[PDB]
Design a protein around this ligand. Structure first.
Ligand SMILES: CCCCCCCCCCCCCCCC(=O)O
Ligand SMILES: CCCCCCCCCCCCCCCC(=O)O
Lengths: 156, 156
C-alpha cells in the first residue's frame, strides 16, 4: 500500500486530456453504484507552475452526471499528492509514459486505482500493466469501459 | 464464447454446498447494482437422477435478500445445461475438481461467470484459474468477496 510509485515523474508532462479506461477498488462499495464514492471519470489534468495538480472530472451525484474541480497539492515525494478536502487523501502516480497511459491510486485502506489512457481506445498493454500493478493489492471490484462509453459523460 | 468446457464432467459429483467467491460479466449493468440481473449467490447444487440440476441461490430483489430455486435441464453436452425460463439461457461448466472449486459461465453475449469454491475461504489458486479462463472473454465488471461476506446472506 501502495508499493509502486514512479521514479523521475515530471508532473508538467501529464498535462491534458485523459480517459478512465479501468477502475479498481478495495471495497465493492467504493465503485458499486453509479453514485458510488470513488466512481469518478477523469477529464483533464492541469498541473500548476508551483507543481500542484488541478483535476477536472465527472461524478454521478443527484441523478445527474456532475462536473467537478479538485486540487491535489504536491508533497515532498514527486509521485504523491494530497487532495484538499477531508480527511485527508493521498494520490500516488505508479507509472506513466506520458503519451499513452497513466496508472494512479487514491488511498484513504480504502483504496481505488485507475488506468488512464490518452485516447478513447482499449489499450491491452496498459490494461495488462494495470492488472500487474494490482495483483499486489487487495482489490474486490474492477470495472472497464468500452470506447463508446468513453466518449459519453459519466461513461453511460 | 465460451471456448472452455470441461471434458468428462460427472454432474452427480458437483452436488452440495458452494460459495460464489468471484463473479464477472460482459456488461457492467449485469452485476452493478445489488439487485442487478446476474448478481446471484449460489448456495447448493442438487443434481437429479435424470441428470438435471436443481440450483438453490440467493438474489437481492425487493429491498431484500430473497431465496430462489431454479432448474437447469441437461442437454446432449455433459458440461452444458439449459435454464427453464425465458429466453432461453445456457449454463456451461468450464472446469471443476469437485472437492474445491468450480468455474461456470452463464450466457444469453450478455455473459456472466463465477468462481465457485467449497468453503468460505479465498482460494488464490482457483481465482487464478478463473482469471486465466476469463482473459479469453470480454468481461467489463469483476467482483470478489471476502470470507466474512461469504458467510452472510447475499454477501452483505
Ligand atoms: C495523476 C492524477 C490522477 C487523478 C487523481 C484523481 C483524484 C480523484 C479523487 C476524487 C475523490 C472523490 C471526489 C468526489 C467528491 C464528492 O462528491 O464527495
Ligand atoms: C454448475 C452449476 C452452476 C450454477 C449456475 C447458476 C445459474 C444461475 C442463473 C440465474 C439467472 C438469473 C436468475 C434471477 C431470476 C430473476 O430474479 O429474474
Amino acid at each position: 500500500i501502495v508499493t509502486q510509485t514512479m521514479k523521475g515523474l515530471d508532473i508538467q508532462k501529464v498535462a491534458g486530456t485523459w480517459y478512465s479506461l479501468a477502475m479498481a477498488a478495495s471495497d465493492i462499495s467504493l465503485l458499486d453504484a453509479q453514485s458510488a464514492p470513488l466512481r469518478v471519470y477523469v477529464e483533464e489534468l492541469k498541473p500548476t507552475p508551483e507543481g500542484d495538480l488541478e483535476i477536472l472530472l465527472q461524478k454521478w451525484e443527484n441523478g445527474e452526471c456532475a462536473q467537478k474541480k479538485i486540487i491535489a497539492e504536491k508533497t515532498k515525494i514527486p509521485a504523491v499528492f494530497k487532495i484538499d478536502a477531508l480527511n485527508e487523501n493521498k494520490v500516488l502516480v505508479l507509472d506513466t509514459d506520458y503519451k499513452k497511459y497513466l496508472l494512479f491510486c487514491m488511498e484513504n485502506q480504502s483504496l481505488a486505482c485507475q488506468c488512464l489512457v490518452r485516447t478513447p481506445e482499449v489499450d491491452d498493454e496498459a490494461l495488462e500493466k494495470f492488472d500487474k500493478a494490482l495483483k499486489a493489492l487487495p482489490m474486490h471490484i474492477r470495472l472497464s469501459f468500452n470506447p463508446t462509453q468513453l466518449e459519453e459523460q459519466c461513461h453511460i
